[PDB]
């Protein structure tokens, strides 16, 4: 007899809701995320059923982060194709991404681990605190110290690597602590990504020529370069202007060589990879079998450094 | 070691919560605070649990408003600038999402496992609400009025239904208030749709006829566009997004000529009836008489 | 056959005529309706033909306004939004042109062949009017006042001269009213140029001093710029196209300091004289006294 | 003694009025319009004097339509050069084009046929009803069915082909009906043009890379592709955004192959050309001499299909 | 010869000086005219020299205003449009700079060589004033209040210090008024900073709270931002450059809650004290009592 | 005891003030300005100490003019790199440039000549009257006559060439008058620059493809071309639109050939170089030694004409 009779969710409607998310999963991609899980599973040996739920959760949370990273940054290309919101609009894309956050949270509930929810929130909370500080610096025009940048990347990479490995740990019968190691793989990953954005014919095709400058981000070398001579304000002022122009991007890229900021970056990645390899050997000299996979993942992720 | 991990300092939390702490220092309605206090007359959650439910709802509330004003591209919010006009869409969006998960770290404090599924399922239905509202907005499809109401059931289901579902989850009473509270959410949304165009308390707060500037197929607007399809003026006006008052004013006039405002007042009437019967429905079945919920039902249709 | 041709449905005609049907549901002057009724006192066209002439003039009228508001980029029109702000320049332009030819399919109904040449020649002179107005606007050449008046003769010749020429073409009287009606068109244009800046009935309708926002070398503006060439303020103000009222206001002040408004009032006076003599001119020569045309001549200079 | 003495139109002034029209006639061009008249005149044999007035009228009405098409569409190139209004301004160009409509109408009056005026209005009225429906769809974002699109192109091509052939018929001593045939040549012309806009190095040079997407137009394959999978809304949403960007245009062009919409388009043009050739043979098996010219015009107009 | 050089005609000088002659036909304060007349009570420059000093100061004055309204992107100036909104930043900038050097060709008329070094050194310090104001504006560094005051000493040193230094250079009295006049320049700047936000005579002239739209770290704004760094609202509001009044209004409210306006009034008080003591300081040392300078000191803090 | 204690200017602050000026001096450049001083010093033989102050003054006044030319014009490239204000903002760059005007004026005071100040003002005043008339024409859309343009360039080049040579004269013990000659070298310089902007692969790399059209400037051939056929208004209307688009710039460049405006320009430069060489020979047939340097500077400055 009711005026309003409540109706069910149709598959047709979910097709709309996931429009921008589905679109992005159609674009060919790195799947670096999967080689890291595969390599850490050589030690944790998470049961196939649980590991598949962990893998779909991370697959989702990944593409959802891109949806919202590319809005917050205003990128123009994503994996060489148009960004999702340049097709669906900032509005529909940022709501697809937010939606997936909770479909992932529904998926995590399938592991029926009681610590799974606390792990998820504590990873997601970490993430938003990384992008919290990053935006604050970017928006306030005050460049962070290299230490601050790193602390910020520990949180940021706390929402994928740390979340996936913590979830695998929570499902594995062993209680080695891998999080300090994976946090370091994250830091090595981002500093590399920051370098490749400014110096790679593979990355000027996929994201854009020096796409980090267009968005204003204080990336790892951009920091070192602004600080190295601070009486020069050419570099920080270029970040302010947020240039889509390429002559400006080229000049900034060239000032950054003249501060030898790309050597600097390359030798820190050298120092951090030594810490990784020694940390892995530490894990193996205590009971864990030789991991070829994760040494190869580490060589892969520095291959242009 | 090259990298020594740092602890999250209280000044950084201040930065993250900046947009959020702003929207909270603005004065608002808190009709939701009395919606909880009325339902708590029947459910009787202890004040230790009720406060957690109340902090969750007030966070999740201010978190949507952070994001909704970006999605809508609102110009104002409770008379004052939208938070993202001070901090930038970038920081507002992030601060908004950050809360979503602090609200979750807060829900776990109830230590109730039925609570985590109630939060996922509520947040999921909220996004299928906005998802379909934005889809019509952007495609310029006009939904049917049944279609609009289903979408409102989900949106008015990530706050109203969340709060009452978490209360039902901390009480032992086996009685479903979810229909009543969802019907209340819809009556609330339909009034917010009318008052957008028709209240000098709402035009002094969100701007003149802001549902037009946003392109939203709101309840009266749907009625007016569908009441005469040969006139494609109102829908064309929604496609342009008019910050100009002389268009907004003209559109409000067209919607009068289609008795969309009489029509709207009339659905709300027919609905409050269903509401005050469903209330007496639960009262006949063992519950004490709830004066307060009757008063919420009539403060939330006080115009019209 | 793959393609079976369809018939033009009445709902599609509704779409085409959308912008047009809008500008017509807005209230207007219809000084042109009384301009026809006054001249019909002398010409005495039967109401069967007069109605066709009247439908043609009211269509061609609303069709220019559709297009003129795009060319000028007007913001308002008779108090209400320009049609193209609801439908988009694209649809408004097309709907405007579409009428131009429906007005022609209407002219053929008189079944008068002198009528088709009167319509071509009128529409041609209208476009040489706007053509030269836009040319000065864009080049920032300021026309001489003789130059401005020649251009107005053509523009005020695709409506006034059209309507009277079609009436003269359905009457047997061999007397030329075209000079009188063209002089009337110019007196009308010059007043519309003054009232743009000086009427609270015209600022409440087209916006404050809208001839400035449009860059138009209007009659008083020409006088003021040419009255002192060492001051390039007024012309520079036309180059910027000021939606800002504080510039518009400043410019209106400058034009007072140059007695462009006294000057303008004075041309209109001198012209109405020529008009009311040319009227008595045709009356001495066999025509009955026309009270109504005297009243149009003075309603159309009622300010000043 | 008069205050205002009325002055004549100078050649100098007409030079201004026709600025955008004259400009466009200076750009080298297809003159496909003239091979169609030439080929249909093999049957109608319109007297040279009349045919020259018909030819100048169509020459004018053509360039005038471009003036206003390129404003309504906001094209950036026209026959490889800048659009007229990118030189003279939307205002001066749309008034030049409107002006020519009536100079053509003055020219038609030179044939001193009484049916010439009714033909002209009935063609022009048809035209504006084609662009009427096209804009309405484009502006309302609701994609037409293939049948609707075609009915719309029957009107659109009713203002050049149909007008020129009807005018020739009205001047010829024979009363064969050629309009059903020419209407079909029009439909074949537009569907081809729609295809070439998205798939031709000759058309990405002359109009722009996928210039139809920039303007949002529901062109013949863009329709078929939106409808073929309607749970995907990537294509229609690209039309909404009206991208000038090329990566977006490339993605849309590529989605359209994956719906096999270019085969679809190519095989309809095949089916319609069969109807043409059979209609021509119908006209010849009834008294008309073999028309090589119009078979060659038809092969020419599909040469990339 | 192909090229025969031409002479600079008086109509061309009219063009160059167009923006300049405009800002001069607008009515202004001329507190600087009475600042000179007060100091001339002690210095007694002959009216033949005083007039040259006065023409230099009134040119250099109107020349900064031409350029400052471009650098700030002011919308208004003394109630009326900024000169560059009529002529374009291009012509305004150039006309502004042109004067800078006509002011110099005017200084040489004093035939005093100490005068040319006083003009260079004054103009140099003006640019180190604006240079550092713009640097903070753009970098979003907030200066310390000592930092702000040093910058004001230079800016209020290319007009105040210029005028008095040129007067001291045409008088034989060996007494330094430069400290007093610089202190007066700062008291003047601090009041202009308060009145921007707090005067209906200043909001009716430059627009509501125009120091916000310009992003300027002005004296009260510095105090408010630095009085609470955990709240990044006011500084974020400066980063956006708000032409919207509802943000400007909100920011003005925040600055009340930080007693930046009480604080500001209090620095001015403490300063006028230093001023009226330094005045009595020079008077004890052989100078006649200067009523007029006491009155300037109190007209230039008449609000507060 | 004072509330405000006044503080000194630090080197740190001057580094900020000169940010845009220092930036521009870092970009590799022509230093044509120095070959002209060097060649005229073969006759004037200005003492090394004075000549160095004259040379630093002109070095400064030069880079300062660029700071403000590139704002007033809204250039996008300067010597092939980004314009200064595209890095520091119209505001900070136009104040750096204005600042340098007076640091130069401080430098001129080091020659301790009493006529040095009057020379400086009279040069700077001339300059601003050249850019005064140029902007007025550009902004008012009314094209100057070739004579007007030239008078305007006599002032414009009165603020570098004339200033540097007048300063050298004021320091030299001889009183030959070189200003009529140098004024003519200026005119030859600008007409050449105007030509090269529209027709040079060296100048389409350094400033931009036909950068003069983007800014609307009535340059020497653009004048001749607008006037040559004045019933065509295509060219002047392109200046109005201020096109950054390249197809528009190409069309305008091509209309300018069809008016044979580049021959015209090239043969005036021929006629003016004859006046130069005959004026120099005049100076030498009166007491001055053969100047190879200034003949080579003149051949250099027409090398593409």
From Swiss-Prot, chains A, D, F:
Motif (DDXXD 1): 69-73
Transferase among keywords: yes
Record-listed dimethylallyl diphosphate binding positions: 78, 156-157, 190, 197, 207, 217
Source organism, top-level taxon: Eukaryota
Motif (DDXXD 2): 193-197
GO biological process: alcohol biosynthetic process; isoprenoid biosynthetic process; mycotoxin biosynthetic process
UniProt binding sites for isopentenyl diphosphate: 30, 33, 62, 79
Protein residues bound to Mg(2+) 3: 69, 73
GO MF terms, alphabetically ordered: isomerase activity; metal ion binding; prenyltransferase activity
Span list, region Geranylfarnesyl diphosphate synthase (PT): 2-305
Keyword Translocase: no
Residue numbers binding Mg(2+) 4: 69, 73
Domain notes: The bifunctional copalyl diphosphate synthase is composed of an N-terminal type II terpene cyclase (TC) catalytic domain and a C-terminal prenyltransferase (PT) catalytic domain which are separated by a linker region.
Assembly, per entry: Homohexamer.
Family note: In the N-terminal section; belongs to the terpene synthase family. In the C-terminal section; belongs to the FPP/GGPP synthase family.
Protein's job: Bifunctional terpene synthase that possesses both prenyltransferase and type II terpene cyclase activity, converting isopentenyl diphosphate (IPP) and dimethylallyl diphosphate (DMAPP) into geranylgeranyl diphosphate (GGPP) and further converting GGPP into copalyl diphosphate, respectively.
Name recorded for this polypeptide: Copalyl diphosphate synthase
Organism listed in the record: Talaromyces verruculosus (Penicillium verruculosum)
Gene: PvCPS
First-to-last residue of the parent protein present: 659 to 963 of 963
Swiss-Prot record, chains B, C, E:
Geranylfarnesyl diphosphate synthase (PT): annotated segments: 1-304
List of residues binding isopentenyl diphosphate: 29, 32, 61, 78
Motif window: DDXXD 2: 192-196
Positions with a binding annotation for dimethylallyl diphosphate: 77, 155-156, 189, 196, 206, 216
Motif DDXXD 1 location, chain numbering: 68-72
Disulphide connectivity of cysteines: none
Binding site for Mg(2+) 4: 68, 72
Positions of Mg(2+) 3 binding: 68, 72
Assembly, per entry: Homohexamer.
Function: Bifunctional terpene synthase that possesses both prenyltransferase and type II terpene cyclase activity, converting isopentenyl diphosphate (IPP) and dimethylallyl diphosphate (DMAPP) into geranylgeranyl diphosphate (GGPP) and further converting GGPP into copalyl diphosphate, respectively.
Domains as described in the record: The bifunctional copalyl diphosphate synthase is composed of an N-terminal type II terpene cyclase (TC) catalytic domain and a C-terminal prenyltransferase (PT) catalytic domain which are separated by a linker region.
Family: In the N-terminal section; belongs to the terpene synthase family.
The protein's name: Copalyl diphosphate synthase
Source organism per UniProt: Talaromyces verruculosus (Penicillium verruculosum)
Gene from which the chain derives: PvCPS
Full-protein positions shown: 660 to 963 of 963
